[PDB]
Amino acid sequence: GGYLVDPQTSETIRGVLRSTASLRQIASVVNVEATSFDVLVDKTDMGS
Amino acid sequence: GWASETAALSETATPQIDRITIPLHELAAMPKASQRLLDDSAFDIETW
């Protein structure tokens, strides 16, 4: 009778859980719609 | 069995069962037709 019985497949196709910490949590994201982004940053300071 | 009146009938056979897998293959054709014909050939080449 082995052929009569068929196993109940599953409810969904479950997967391995992988971590979701992505450094996008604390870093600064910007919505840029150009081909690039230019951050301007003085590498030195003034004089007095 | 052809059981008697007083016989104390025993267990009997039961048919063994076979399973046959119809693999359900695929049959594909791919005819190519030029668009200059499909629109300029008043016969319905699409449905033909």
Side-chain angles (χ1 to χ4, degrees):
Chain A
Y3 295 120
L4 280 305
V5 284
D6 271 17
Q8 167 180 350
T9 310
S10 197
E11 67 273 16
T12 78
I13 171 165
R14 304 187 284 237
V16 183
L17 278 70
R18 297 277 181 176
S19 308
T20 69
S22 191
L23 190 75
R24 192 196 168 106
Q25 300 85 0
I26 61 184
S28 62
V29 304
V30 191
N31 266 5
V32 55
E33 301 283 4
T35 173
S36 315
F37 192 84
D38 292 358
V39 302
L40 302 167
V41 285
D42 65 9
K43 56 182 311 309
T44 61
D45 63 337
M46 288 176 156
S48 278
Chain B
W2 281 126
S4 286
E5 173 88 52
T6 68
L9 163 75
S10 54
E11 71 166 30
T12 82
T14 325
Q16 34 190 15
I17 291 169
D18 189 358
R19 156 185 264 187
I20 304 185
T21 46
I22 303 300
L24 192 45
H25 308 108
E26 163 159 51
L27 171 66
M30 188 156 60
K32 185 179 66 181
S34 46
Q35 183 69 27
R36 295 182 34 162
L37 172 83
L38 263 65
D39 305 357
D40 305 357
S41 89
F43 301 98
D44 218 356
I45 292 279
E46 162 50 15
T47 81
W48 167 63

